[PDB]
Amino acid sequence: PPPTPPQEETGLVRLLRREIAAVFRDNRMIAVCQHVALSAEDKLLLRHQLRKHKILMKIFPNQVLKPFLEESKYQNLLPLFVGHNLLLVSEEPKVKEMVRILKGIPFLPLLGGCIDDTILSRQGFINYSKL
């Protein structure tokens, strides 16, 4: 191969890195939920039902999310992000209220997550909920 042409970070990449660092700092509950194709109406309704319990949703590209997460303390979440995904952000978490809405839609799975530094599968969220 030709010698190595190092690529340079854009402002986009740095803004995303900053934003994601802040995202992992602030919210106590970060729940990975596979992004699923819905009507715009239904996605808006979902965002609003999350607005009622104050929970926020966020979406980042795998491109800039994966290296950040493999260098992060959170690297055990790497196998989760291989497909499409949606990041559920919660400050001052109540999990049972998120599970309430996720229950309404059967085809919209909750996969992994971390609640107050505790990395859990869906069953861990079912357990944290009943608590």
Partner 1 sequence: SGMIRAIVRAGQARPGPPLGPILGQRGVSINQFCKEFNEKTKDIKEGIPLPTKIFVKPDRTFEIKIGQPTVSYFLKAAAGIEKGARHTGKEVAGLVTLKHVYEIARVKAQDDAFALQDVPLSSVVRSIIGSARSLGIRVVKDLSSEELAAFQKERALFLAAQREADLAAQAEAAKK
Partner 2 sequence: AAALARLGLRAVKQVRVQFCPFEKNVESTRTFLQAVSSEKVRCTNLNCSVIADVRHDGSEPCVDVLFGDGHRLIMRGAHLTAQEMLTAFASHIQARG
Partner 3 sequence: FKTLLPVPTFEDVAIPEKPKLRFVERVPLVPKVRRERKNLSDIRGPSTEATEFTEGRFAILALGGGYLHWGHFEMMRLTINRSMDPKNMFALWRVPAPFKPITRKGMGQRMGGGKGAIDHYVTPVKAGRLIVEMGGRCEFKEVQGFLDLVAHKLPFPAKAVSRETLEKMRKDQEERERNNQNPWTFERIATANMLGIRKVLSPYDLTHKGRYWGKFYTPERV
Binding site for partner 1 (CB under 8 A): 44-45, 47-48, 51
Name the residue nearer to partner 2 (CB basis): 1 or 83. 83
Name the residue nearer to partner 1 (CB basis): 51 or 84. 51
Q: Residue from 62, 75, 118, 121 that binds partner 2 (CB under 8 A)?
A: 121
Q: Which does 51 bind (CB under 5 to 8 A by kind): RNA, partner 2, partner 1, none?
A: partner 1
Q: Which does 13 bind (CB under 5 to 8 A by kind): partner 3, partner 2, RNA, none?
A: partner 3
**How would DSSP label each residue in the chain?**
----------HHHHHHHHHHHHHHHH-SEEEEE------HHHHHHHHHHHHHTT-EEE---HHHHHHHHHHSTTGGGGGGTTS--EEEEESS--HHHHHHHHHH-TT--B---EETTEE--HHHHHHHHH-
